[PDB]
Structure formats: C-alpha cells, structure tokens
Amino acid sequence: SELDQLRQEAEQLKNQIRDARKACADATLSQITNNIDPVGRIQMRTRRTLRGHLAKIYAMHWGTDSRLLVSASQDGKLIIWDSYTTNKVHAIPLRSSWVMTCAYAPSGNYVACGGLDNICSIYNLKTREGNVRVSRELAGHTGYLSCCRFLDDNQIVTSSGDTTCALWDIETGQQTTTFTGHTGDVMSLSLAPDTRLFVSGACDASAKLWDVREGMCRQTFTGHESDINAICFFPNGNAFATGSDDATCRLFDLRADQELMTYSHDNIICGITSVSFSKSGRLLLAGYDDFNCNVWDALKADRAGVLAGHDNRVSCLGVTDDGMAVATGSWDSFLKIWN
Amino acid sequence: LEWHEAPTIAVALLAALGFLSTLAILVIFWRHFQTPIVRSAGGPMCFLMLTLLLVAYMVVPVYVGPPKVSTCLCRQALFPLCFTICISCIAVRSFQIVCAFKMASRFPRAYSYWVRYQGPYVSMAFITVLKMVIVVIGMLAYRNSLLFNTSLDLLLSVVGFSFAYMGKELPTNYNEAKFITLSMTFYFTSSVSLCTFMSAYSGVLVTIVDLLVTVLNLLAISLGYFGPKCYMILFYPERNTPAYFNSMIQGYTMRRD
Amino acid sequence: QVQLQESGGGLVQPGGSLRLSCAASGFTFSNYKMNWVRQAPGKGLEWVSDISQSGASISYTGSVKGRFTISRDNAKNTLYLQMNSLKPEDTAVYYCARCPAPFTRDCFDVTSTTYAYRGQGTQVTVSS
Amino acid sequence: EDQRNEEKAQREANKKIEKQLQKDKQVYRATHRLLLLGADNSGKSTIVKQMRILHGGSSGIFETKFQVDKVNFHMFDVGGQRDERRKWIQCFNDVTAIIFVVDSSDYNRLQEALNDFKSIWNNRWLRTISVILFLNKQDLLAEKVLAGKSKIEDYFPEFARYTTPEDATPEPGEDPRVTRAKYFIRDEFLRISTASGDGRHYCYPHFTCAVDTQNVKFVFDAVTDIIIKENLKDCGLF
Amino acid sequence: ASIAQARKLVEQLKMEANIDRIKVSKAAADLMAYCEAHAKEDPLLTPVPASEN
C-alpha cells in the first residue's frame, strides 16, 4: 500500500535526521561550561504585590518601557499596572470572561487578549477620548486562543488550540499567513528578537520554528515527552527554552538543530507553565504547578534560587526588557515583582 | 468553712468528677481528630474551652479553706472568666453555624466583612478584654459586684439564644437549641436564687452555697455540651464519617417538602 | 520523540486467542499510566483497558472483562494485551495509548480522533 | 511640579478603577457559574432551553445568564472546541458546580460517559468542584427496558447480580426492571464519585422528572447545598 | 485524505532535513560567549545598587 511506503519513507527521513544530529553532537553544554564559576545563591524579594484582580490570572506581558504591564484574569478584566507606583492605569472589561492570553504592543498603543471565545480582541489604549475600546475583533480561529504577540502596531501572531498558528493583518482583520503542521493544541509562542522568526510549543511534545515571511516550518524539535506549555527565545535568538508537563525545562539550539541541556530535579514532579530568560540569558526562570518559580543556571543547570510566596499555581512569568525585574502572576489573583 | 464537712466533701467530689470527665473528653477529642465532629464543634475553640474548664476545676480546692486575699482575688479572676469565655465561645459558634447555613446570601457583604476581618478571633478578644475591664472596675469598689457579671453573662446567653432561635431545623450536629435553653435557664435560676440568698441569710456557709452553684454551672456548660458529642463518636462510629456529614447536610438543605 | 509501536494483530478464528505488544520509546515508561483503545469499522474510538504506573490498578470495559488481560513490564518498556475468547464484533484496530501527563491518576483525550501519544494501531480481525 | 500633578492624577484614576473593581466584585462573588458537560446525545441543549424559558435571560461558548429567586446564575456550555479538553478544562477550576448530563437510554455509549465522568472527577484542577449528575432520557430508558430487545447485562456483566437498593423511591406506575436499571446506572456513576472524593467534593445524581420544573429546583438546591458546605468548610466547621 | 496528510508530512520532513548543522561545541561556545559578554548588564544576575531601582 502507498501509506506503508510513505510511513517507511518518513521513518527513513527521521532516522537520517537523527543520525545527522548525533554526528553533529561532538560535545555537550555541560562538558564545555564545566570550567566556569557557578552563579551565587540568587535571592529575589517581592518589591511590589499588585492586587485588584478577582479571579485567577492567566497571562501577563511587560511593556517595552519596562514600567507598565498588562495582565488578564478569568473574571473578564484587563488591568494595566504602573509597576513603579503600583497604581492602576486601565481596567478593560471583556465580553468573554474566559481569557487565556494577553499581550502588550511594542509601542504601548494597543493591547490584545483572547481565550475560549476563539477571538483575538485588540484594544486601543491611547485613543483621542482616553477611553479604552475594542478596535478590531480578529476572528477565524476554530480553537481557543492561547498566546498572542505583536509584531508591530498592524501585525500580530496568535497561536490557537486548533493546532494552527496565524499572522494577522489588524487593519483588514484577515489572516495574512497560516502556520500549520502541529498535531496538538498550540500553547505557547515566542518571537525572535529580529521578529523574522518565532517558535511555538504545542501539546504534541514538539516545538516548531516558523518563518514569518514565508509561512513554513524551518525546523522541528522533539526532545520533550509531554505537552509543552511555555516557550521563550534566548536573548541571542539562536536558542530557546521550553516548559512541559513532564516537569522538565529543555534548551534547544537552532543552528545545532538539537537539544542542548535539560533542567530537571528528582524532587520536582509538577508541570511547568511559564519560562523566561534573564536579560543576558544566564538565568532561566520557570514557573511550576507547586506554586513556586525556580531560577535555573542556563549554562550549568544548577537551581540557583526559588521565588516562593504565591498561594496558588504560577501561570505567567515575564522579565522586563531592561532585565530590571521579573513579574510573576499566579492563580490567587495576585501579581508580584522580584529583583 | 471546714475541710471535713458534708457539703464541702460533696462539692469536692463533684468537682473531681467534673475534672475527670473533662480530662476524658480532652483525651477523646485529641485522639479522634481530623474528623467532622470535632471540626464542626469548633476545632481548637473546643480545646480552648476544655483546658480552661480544666484549670477552673483544678482551682476549685483553692476556693475552700481559710480566708485569703489570693483565694478572694481568684474568686472573680477565674470562675467568672470561665463562664464568660465558654458562653461567648458557644455564642460565636452558634453565630458561625447560623451565618453559614443562612443569611450568607441574605446579608452577603456583612459576611464578607466578618470573614475578612477575622471576626471569630476578634469578637472573642473584645469579649475577654471587656470582661477583664469590668471585673477590675468592679473590684475597685457580693450582690452588687456580681450583679454586673451576671447581667453580662445573661446578655451573652440571650444573644446566643436569639441567634440559635432560627436554627431549630438545622442538622443535629449543628443544632444546640436544647443546650442553650437548658444552660440559660440554669444560669438564670441559679443566679436569681443566689442573689436572693445573699441578703437574707446567716452569712456563714454561704461560701459553700456559692461555690456549689458555680461548680454546678461549670458541670452544666461542660457536660451538656461535650457529653453528647463523645457519646455519638464512641458508641456510633458509623455516625462519624465525612460521607455521613455530606449526606446529612445535603438531606437538610434539599428537603422533599 | 514519543513513539508507540504495536504488533500481534492478524487473522483469528472466533473463539481464538491473541496477544498484543506496545514497544514504547522516547519517554520513561514507569511514570505514565497506559491504555488500550480500539476502533471498530464504522465506529469511533472506544476505550478498552488501562493500567497504573506500577500495575496495581487495572480496569476494563464490560464487553471485554473476563476475556482481555492488560499487563506492563517497566524493564522492557512494553505493554501487553492478551485477548481470549475473541468474538466477531471485536474486529477493530487496536491502539496503545498513554496518559498525557506523568504521575496523574486521570487520563484525558485518550480516545480523541487525533492524539499525539498514540500508536499507529494494529488491525485485529475475527472471522470463521 | 509636573510630577506632583501626574502622581495625583494617577492616584485619582487608581481610586476610580478600584471603586469600579469593588463594585464588580460585589456582583461576581454573588453569581454562581455552572459548567455544562456531556456528550452529543446527552441532552444539554434541552436543559439550557428549559432553564432559559423558565427564567428569561441571555460562538465558542453557549453562555446564558439568568436570575432565579433573586440569585444570579451563569450556565455555559463549551462548544466549538476540538475533541481534546485537557487544556481548556483547566479554566473551570473555580466554577461552582459541573452539570454533567448522561443519556441513560444509550447503553452503547454509557461506558464513554462513565470514563468522561471519571476523568473529570479525578482531574488535578477539577478536584474540589462538585458535580450535579443529570441522568437524562428516563422515558426512553423505560421504553428500552420494557421492550426487552436490548439488555444491560450485554454491555455490563455486573448487572446480573445487581439488586435494587433499599433507599429507592417507588415512583407510581414503575416497573421493577425500570427502577432496577435506573438505580444500577446511578450507582455505577456514584461509585466513581465515592471512590476518590474523600469529602473534597460531592455528586448529586437526579433522574430527570420528564419535562418538569423540578430539574431547575434540583439545580438550585444543589448549588445552595454546595455554597452552604463551602461556607462551613471556610469557617472550619466541616 | 490520510494519503495527502502522509505526503505533506514526508515533504515537510524532506524540507527539515538537508540543512546545515553547526557542531554542538560551537553552539555552546557561542552561547557561553554571549552570556559572558553581557554579564555586566544583567540587573538580576549582578545585584544593582538600591539607588538604581
């Protein structure tokens, strides 16, 4: 049968790819960074405790100015915090209270949110009248929205639970490009610093690197063993890290096209919800289901510290653009800032 | 007041029986923990009243003996403190039961304020502080001094009764209407009889009568509150199960009408 | 990558016997609760059996109880399904499934039309 | 001097935002959200339609907001998603109750309903949420039992030795076989709830009373009981 | 139906293969160099004085 021949060809191609990757791995990251001195005991403290949310916080996103941030809760609100003064700038009620994601535009002009309504709503913050109102209702996804990131004021990449990603032209409200190839619900999405590429981790234990312009999957990484919930690009853009239900963080390299290091501990058995690198990429903060966020040595895989204090499951994580602080939101409707 | 005299030994043996019963109840509650009965009875609140009752029973022999400033001070330092703390604890538990079963949606914001400001732990502190204050201002100046304390205790018991009054139909493990009626009526009649007897009496051996009344009251608000619970949780282990509590609360809430 | 390969299916006369295997690779076997699923022609995916990580907890469907046996061997990273007293309506494609997350009692989306942690399946046919 | 004015304006805006937030919380904490789950043939649509018709109210969610005895309610059915639910089911980890609907007359797909109920009950996040079990389509179950063409023992071998429980309500004009089948299905669903509930959450089965308002009353009573037990547990009295 | 899906999967696998692969040692060296070069500009790694936030 033709299906058997196609499956055999796919297996042969996978074997060839694995053989090439094995031949390409002449050493390991641990075997090379063994001579560098470890980071000292990392101790962050809760500088601010942003409170005012009703239900569990599901996502957050820092601003480019590294002062304002936006968070989305499951009670149907979008609160924009002035992190320096703990004040609230905006509180946008949402048509659907089931919201899984939120984003901050690089210019700070708009915000985006989405969820079980399968719609990416975009709200204009700095309008003429000063009242935040929905500007575009991006529809076309047949699954829940899980992540959204602004390319610029007129473009946004959204990942959905219909196993497809998309690039939206906000002005026309239409899908410029569709990224298909995932066999499971896409859960995370991370833009490269150059914005020309992005990665997405789905519930099929695979992360695919996509091309924004051409709309094709350049590379696929299959080092995990469970659904991938988080993904974050390295500051260099040549690597990224992933979190998964199998209680492991894994660093993949784009040029080597294979996994470089794993960050797991015997006593850690809960899933990972959010990951984010430091400004220099030396630290890898990762939220967990055990209400704790662990700081990992991105070069030596030593757990440098722990950010304890959240009463419920940590769900979102984010490091400012200048690396000044890291903000963690969890399911007890509380946001915290650490440095 | 002699050590060898029939009323005194009778009261001493009654106090010893109360002490043994309270110690047994304490051991039973400690052994059978993490079970719905003790949690519904008050949890650590029950242990608080039990140990305070234990100390009140232990200081009973101090009451008996030659007159002394220490015994005289303890007279209103400990036993009225026992009465007021125990009755306020029962009233707080009754208010919690009634506000959980009812008036949670009728008075929503009031319950949010009550549960956000640590109401159960705040009302008790207010009560003990106020009783300490009224006690010291009373001893600054038998019948007149004790009248204020009995009025306070009767007001607390009346508050507990008025809050448990609408809870006649509440489940058996959350209903204390019978205990409240019995204890209030016993305290009222004992205080009335004692106040009447302070004036028209010889003046000697009246300490025996007053101590006898106080130990009967202590035995009342100890046994009438804790005996049924221990009876149920030793002689009916099947009746002490989280599944049973689930089913019985459910049967109360959704009645067949 | 997570990969499950099944084997053992084939022609079996009614009242016969069979044994299925599931060579699991790409993940630690002793951490996940395993499953067996089948898909009769013209019908949707139907759960058949499951087994705990240590093999202590085992459950089947009503139509296969007393005939099918599920077992696992964490040493060889394989899952077995011995099938006895086969009947014609048992003709189905049998897939070896895995719970999405480790150390988890409940199992979600085992019988979904698409599921990443599922094998290609082996056709089992019963006819005289 | 600009900084002082900017900070004053920020504080005033934050005060307005917090006032609106507390006004919204006063309503959010007084509204009960119920998640409807089931199968294609379970019959959630008729329940939603009846509850909307009895009390006037109300894409990817079948939202419905109504008011029953001056109590706010919110019933939503999650349609339009894929068959995989292990990720979006985590949103409803704070709902008041889950209204699970079962087709009792469909023996072929009854095991699928049992597996779905087991998965929902044993979920890590859905482990403190009570389930209101709705055994729909009782007239069809009675017709199937009385016909005799299809037998429960064909799909469930444990029905041969099953006996009607003592605490069974003898509805008027009820065949012993019909009530035996009803209570067998109810007990099959209750075994999963009692096997691992451990008092964290409860199950409230209810055979549908044909087409009557009694189902809405049962939902209201179950929600009231759940709220009462939640208050008791928060007070430390249960 | 499934034949087209298998064909597209095979085509995607062909596209993923036949690409350059820089050795793991070189990639690790580049990552370490980037981390070391920017170590002075990491507020989370090097504790910034309390004066500068």
Structure description:
The complex is a heteropentamer of chains A (339), B (257), C (128), D (238) and E (53). Chain A has 339 residues and is mainly beta. Chain A has a single domain, classed as Methylamine Dehydrogenase, Chain H, CATH 2.130.10.10. Chain A is built from two helices and 28 strands. Chain A has a four-stranded antiparallel beta sheet, with no helix packed on it. In chain A, strands 2-3-4-5 form a four-stranded antiparallel beta sheet, with no helix packed on it. In chain A, a hairpin with a 2-residue loop joins strand 10 and strand 11. Chain A starts with a helix and ends with a strand. With 257 residues, chain B is mostly helical. Chain B starts with 5 loop residues before the first helix and ends with a helix. Chain D has a single domain, classed as Rossmann fold (3-Layer(aba) Sandwich). Chain D has seven helices and six strands, in the order αβαβββαβαααβα. By secondary structure, chain E is mainly alpha-helical. Chain E is elongated, with a radius of gyration of 22 Å. Chains in contact: A-C, A-D, A-E, B-D, C-D. At the A-E interface, helix 1 and strand 17 of A face helix 1 and helix 2 of E. Chain A: It comes from Homo sapiens (Human). Chain A: One of its GO terms (cellular component) is cytosol. Chain A: InterPro entries: G-protein_beta_WD-40_rep (IPR020472), Gprotein_B (IPR001632), Guanine_nucleotide-bd_bsu (IPR016346), WD40/YVTN_repeat-like_dom_sf (IPR015943), WD40_repeat_CS (IPR019775), WD40_repeat_dom_sf (IPR036322), WD40_rpt (IPR001680). Chain A: Pfam families: WD40_Gbeta. Chain A: GO terms for molecular function: GTPase activity; GTPase binding; protein-containing complex binding; signaling receptor complex adaptor activity.
Secondary structure topology:
The complex is a heteropentamer of chains A (339), B (257), C (128), D (238) and E (53).
Chain A lengths: L1 H23 L4 H4 L13 E6 L5 E6 L5 E6 L3 E6 L4 E7 L5 E6 L5 E6 L3 E6 L8 E7 L5 E8 L2 E6 L3 E6 L4 E7 L9 E2 L5 E5 L5 E5 L5 E5 L6 E6 L5 E6 L4 E5 L4 E6 L8 E6 L5 E6 L4 E5 L5 E5 L6 E6 L6 E5 L3 E5 L1
Antiparallel strand pairs in A: 1-28, 2-3, 3-4, 4-5, 6-7, 7-8, 8-9, 10-11, 11-12, 12-13, 14-15, 15-16, 16-17, 18-19, 19-20, 20-21, 22-23, 23-24, 24-25, 26-27, 27-28
Chain D lengths: L1 H27 L2 E7 L6 H11 L9 E4 L4 E6 L19 E7 L6 H12 L8 E7 L1 H10 L4 H4 L20 H21 L6 E5 L6 H21 L4
Chain E lengths: L1 H15 L7 H14 L16
